[PDB]
Amino acid sequence: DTLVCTANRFEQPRSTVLAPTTVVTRQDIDRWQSTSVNDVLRRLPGVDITQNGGSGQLSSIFIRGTNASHVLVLIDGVRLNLAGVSGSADLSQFPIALVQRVEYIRGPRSAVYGSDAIGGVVNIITTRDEPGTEISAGWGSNSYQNYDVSTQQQLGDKTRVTLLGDYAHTHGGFLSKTLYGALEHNFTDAWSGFVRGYGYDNRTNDTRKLYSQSWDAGLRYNGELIKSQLITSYSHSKDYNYATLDEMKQYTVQWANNVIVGHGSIGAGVDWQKQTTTPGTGYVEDGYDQRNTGIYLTGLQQVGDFTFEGAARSDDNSQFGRHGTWQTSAGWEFIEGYRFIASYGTSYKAPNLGQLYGFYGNPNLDPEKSKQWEGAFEGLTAGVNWRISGYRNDVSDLIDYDDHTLKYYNEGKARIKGVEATANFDTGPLTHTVSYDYVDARNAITDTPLLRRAKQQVKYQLDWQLYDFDWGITYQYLGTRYDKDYSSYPYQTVKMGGVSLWDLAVAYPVTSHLTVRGKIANLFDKDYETVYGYQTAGREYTLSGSYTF
């Protein structure tokens, strides 16, 4: 419903963000009965998730054809820690119980957040405003079991505590336990503070043990015209496979300001980040200490039928030095309800620890660089909200291994051309939400398709209510995809064919406190893989409930 904060770090109406923008709320996730973050994300425009099996296995996110490491995943506005040792976001381990909102903005945004924000940004928000206590649970195929307790209460005027415990367990598997607490205090009606803690202990079967904890603390000012935020953040994760141990601590501090001016806004902040890893983390001998500080400017202005939006950033990285990025967007509502939008942006990706200092390291690498153009038409027609975008993304200085000298070097190039189309509309009691993605992602030097990516995807959601039963059908076509066959050397490129997949979900309020839900995932039990060799789930049944007071 209308607001985002992820585009410039502060609240604005979505109609005011010129980049394509998806919002997923807790209500959606409960209806969809998602038992992981991937299942939430896989439903959205330009998202191509591949996974080495069912839930908990290593996964990669390809937003609009870009590399796994070319999406910025934020947790409550701060770069996901799990992402820091390898330089590529993998959310298979992150607990769905913590996801209260997802804001997903496509197109570049390094001009606000710095490194990784190339294909787009996915911000997972863990805060809810929803007082009262809840107990939920579920049971499903592969002996899935879930138990969950949460409460949000007032501790008098001005203060609130939120607490959550979640236990999720499956067999052949993947066990996950999660604890979250938060305190929110309002000093005046304009001034706020918060302290927020959470941690999860996961186990995945070769046997993996991931633990992570995050602590965030901040001050906010929310005036009639001025807005300010000061947030400090600390993450500690530890990742065992067995005796290999990857450990990282990530510290972040960021001060941002924004003022309403005219019909629009101007903003600015400063951003600092430190990452220390343990000796032997990322198959690198020594422990490292990496630092980054960035300063940026945002702006938004509406003049008559035109909207202009922009951001500009400079980052100083302890390893590669200085890199600047920028982006600008103009939109023209040429007739009421219809709008052309043109965007241009630059973005980048920092080298990772392995590329820099691993056995094959090159300590002098520069960032990977993206330039993107996009053009869109959006409209409201006869009750249909729609949008169609075409984009071009030239990526250069890709960090590639050279076999001859056994070192990483900047040299590869990629060209992505894509089309995004979306629509939502109702027909009597039925709500339809539909998207189509075309992605022609290639190596620009050799002109061959990049690997692991569906060239086409079609995604359709159908929701309705009949007798207090709330039903959701979800359909997805996963198009043809090229991959390597690793069972035989030299590794040949294989073609994986298109697949249709259907899910069926329902919910019923037994009483005003008690809702029961059931789901059949992959209803037609289709055999398929998103990584060659790795078998996905098959038809699965889940059954759950929630008791509120």
Ligand X SMILES: CCCCCCCCOCCOCCOCCOCCO
Ligand Y SMILES: *SCC1=CC(C)(C)N(O)C1(C)C
State the residues that interact with ligand Y by CB under 6 A.
5-6, 9, 76-77, 123, 125, 127, 229
Under a CB-based contact definition with an 8 Å cutoff, are residues 105 and 71 in contact?
no
Which helix (H) or strand (E) element contains residue 223? none
Based on the shown chain and the rule CB under 5 A, indicate whether residue 400 belongs to the binding site for Mg ion.
no
| Residue number with CB closer to ligand X (196 or 459) | 459
| Residue number with CB closer to ligand X (193 or 324) | 324
**Closest approach of Cβ 22 to ligand X, in Å?**
15
User: What is the Cα–Cα distance from 37 to 96, expressed in whole angstroms?
Assistant: 5
Binding site for ligand X (CB under 6 A): 261-262, 264, 266, 268, 295-297, 299-301, 308-314, 324-326, 328, 335, 338, 375-377, 379, 386, 388, 390-392, 417-419, 421, 423, 434, 436, 438
85 appears as a binding residue in the annotation? yes
**Closest approach of Cβ 530 to ligand X, in Å?**
22
| Residue number with CB closer to ligand Y (91 or 231) | 231
Q: Minimal CB distance to ligand X: which residue?
A: 324
| Residue number with CB closer to ligand Y (76 or 463) | 76
394 appears as a binding residue in the annotation? no
| Residue number with CB closer to ligand X (177 or 417) | 417
Binding-site partner at residue 390 among ligand Y, Mg ion, ligand X, none, CB < 5 to 8 Å by type: ligand X
212 appears as a binding residue in the annotation? no
| Residue number with CB closer to ligand Y (229 or 307) | 229
60 appears as a binding residue in the annotation? yes
Cβ-based neighbour number of residue 122 at 10 Å: 29
Judged by CB under 5 A, the stretch of 21-29, 168-176, 188-196, 322-330 that binds Mg ion is 168-176
Cβ-based neighbour number of residue 441 at 10 Å: 24
Binding-site partner at residue 301 among Mg ion, ligand Y, ligand X, none, CB < 5 to 8 Å by type: ligand X
44 appears as a binding residue in the annotation? no
Residue 465: beta bridge partners?
470
Name the DSSP letter for residue 497: P
Question: Of these, 333, 366, 440, 529, which contacts Mg ion (CB under 5 A)?
Answer: 366
122 appears as a binding residue in the annotation? no
Cβ-based neighbour number of residue 492 at 10 Å: 10
**Closest approach of Cβ 77 to ligand Y, in Å?**
4
User: Which two tokens mark 24?
Assistant: 């997923």
User: What is the Cα–Cα distance from 545 to 140, expressed in whole angstroms?
Assistant: 12
User: What is the Cα–Cα distance from 390 to 455, expressed in whole angstroms?
Assistant: 14
Under a CB-based contact definition with an 8 Å cutoff, are residues 162 and 181 in contact?
yes
Among positive and negative, which fits the CA dihedral 52, 54, 58, 60? positive
**Closest approach of Cβ 169 to Mg ion, in Å?**
6
**Closest approach of Cβ 190 to ligand Y, in Å?**
15
The pairing of beta strand 120-125 with beta strand 71-75: parallel
* Helix, strand, coil share (%) of the chain residues, nearest 5: 5, 60, 30
76 appears as a binding residue in the annotation? no
Binding-site partner at residue 366 among ligand X, Mg ion, ligand Y, none, CB < 5 to 8 Å by type: Mg ion
**Closest approach of Cβ 300 to Mg ion, in Å?**
34
452 appears as a binding residue in the annotation? yes
What are the residue ranges of helices labelled H in 307-352? none
The pairing of beta strand 306-317 with beta strand 289-303: antiparallel
**Closest approach of Cβ 133 to ligand Y, in Å?**
22
Binding-site partner at residue 123 among ligand Y, Mg ion, ligand X, none, CB < 5 to 8 Å by type: ligand Y
Among positive and negative, which fits the CA dihedral 452, 453, 454, 458? positive
128 appears as a binding residue in the annotation? no
**Closest approach of Cβ 325 to ligand X, in Å?**
6
User: What is the Cα–Cα distance from 17 to 15, expressed in whole angstroms?
Assistant: 6
User: What is the Cα–Cα distance from 263 to 75, expressed in whole angstroms?
Assistant: 30
User: Which two tokens mark 340?
Assistant: 């052309």
Cβ-based neighbour number of residue 433 at 10 Å: 19
Q: Which residues are annotated as a binding site?
A: 58, 60, 67, 85-86, 206, 244, 452, 486
